[PDB]
């Protein structure tokens, strides 16, 4: 009966990334050390178990700044945030361990698994 | 050298709809005369030129309740909101004209284009 649009989800995601880039309706700043990352809570909750728990916690849900562990690699976090909004995970010899560890912290187990397959590749 | 996750956009979209279903971080009620639909502004702005204009307008950006034209068919809107959050457009002979007219009003020409292909095959 029904019609399914195969590019719809990727087009929504493209436009969400364009909203992030223009800073339109971004409602949280994630802080890693002194580095600040602007985002939409809902996109974060849709990609990460950590962010889900944080923004359904009544003590934290209304905060505009969330501070993650300052021991987290900011390049690792930046790679993963770009990934949430793009589907593209840019992995390098030099950044891969940091990304894997950051993905564990964010409870994005499937990204970890993809990093493990990547390591098995070479 | 990038890895691209081909199911990522649709998995994000599934989770956004689960968030809509559980009423989590919904920040707007769209009103069609007296019918009500809870949504996330950013999904609406990612899908429709009309909603983009509404939520970037300084008079309306901080409203928790938004009126659409109260004469639009509420079934037509409801089919389209579900489409925004699912990729699935459920077209029957009984609703096609209401969906098409509503899509024009939401500035979703590619959906209108599809309803025209549906008219051409039916």
């Amino acid at each position: 009966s029904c019609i399914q649009f195969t590019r719809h989800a990727s087009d929504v995601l493209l436009n969400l990334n364009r909203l992030r880039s223009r800073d339109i309706l971004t409602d949280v700043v994630i802080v890693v050390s002194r580095e600040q990352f602007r985002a939409h809570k809902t996109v974060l909750m849709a990609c990460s178990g950590l962010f889900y728990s944080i923004f359904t916690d009544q003590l934290k849900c209304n905060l505009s700044v969330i501070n993650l562990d300052p021991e987290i690699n900011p390049e690792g976090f930046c790679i993963l945030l770009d990934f949430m909004y793009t589907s593209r995970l840019n992995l390098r010899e030099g950044n891969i361990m940091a990304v894997m560890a950051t993905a564990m912290y964010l409870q994005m187990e499937h990204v970890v698994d993809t990093c493990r397959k990547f390591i098995k590749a070479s | 050298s990038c890895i691209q996750f081909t199911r990522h956009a649709s998995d994000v979209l599934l989770n956004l709809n689960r968030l809509r279903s559980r009423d989590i971080l919904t920040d707007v009620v769209i009103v069609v005369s007296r019918e009500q639909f809870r949504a996330h502004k950013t999904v609406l702005m990612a899908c429709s030129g009309l909603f983009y204009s509404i939520f970037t307008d300084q008079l309306k950006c901080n409203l928790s309740v938004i009126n659409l034209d109260p004469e639009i068919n509420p079934e037509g809107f409801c089919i389209l909101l579900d489409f925004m959050y699912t990729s699935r457009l459920n077209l029957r002979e009984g609703n096609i004209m209401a969906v098409m007219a509503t899509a024009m009003y939401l500035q979703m020409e590619h959906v209108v284009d599809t309803c025209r292909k549906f008219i051409k095959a039916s």
Binding site: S1, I3 | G49, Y52, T114
Partner: peptide
């Protein structure tokens, strides 16, 4: 279930 690959016409500025 029929599929279409049509691209979304709306692009955020």
């Amino acid at each position: 279930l029929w599929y279409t690959d049509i691209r979304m016409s709306w692009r955020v500025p």
